[PDB]
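Students often ask why we bother predicting the structure of a whole assembly rather than each chain alone. The short answer is interfaces. A chain on its own may look different once its partners are present, and contacts between molecules only exist in the joint model. In this exercise we take two input lines together and write out one structure for the complete complex. Read the inputs first and try to guess which parts will touch.
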Amino acid sequence: NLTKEQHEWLNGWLELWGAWVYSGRLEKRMSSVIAKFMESVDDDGMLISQVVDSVMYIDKKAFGILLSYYAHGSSKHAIASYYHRVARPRKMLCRGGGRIQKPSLATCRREVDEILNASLFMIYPV
DNA sequence: TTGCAACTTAAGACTCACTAACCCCACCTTATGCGAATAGTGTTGCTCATTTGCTCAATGATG
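Now the answer. The structure tokens for the assembled complex follow.
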């Protein structure tokens, strides 16, 4: 797990990073997913963009979520809201049981939280 | 003779008019503007209860 100084440090880096990118100052060549986000609208931001694209290159879903939170500046609650909207029925050993249904909102909140913590966790040493 | 109870007539207000069924249609709108207040609703960090999977723990049944 990361610490909280690392949280605030790299948090501020992703704040100026997403504020830098979202103005449109980044090129297509960094990612086609970064290009995808730029279809939906300095060396610091390009260095970090190589970092974040390098680590979060492989998932692209939480990478897009990461752009939604930092580049766009969206609240966590709306992200888990739409994410609960796009939910499919899954197998979970629930408080209810191992039946197969669409999960609750608070579960989706937990998932945005843990994909946040794991995302930041995988970014930080890079 | 005169008042007075008593009888008579008339005027007026209220109630009230069979039982069941089927079909159709018609149903009810015009100041602006501004600030203040409030309700709502949005976000987030943080609980609490509840089902399963699973492990210990013993005890008589069995090899």
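Check your guess against this: The helical segments of chain A are 4-25, 32-38, 43-55, 61-71, 76-85, 105-123.
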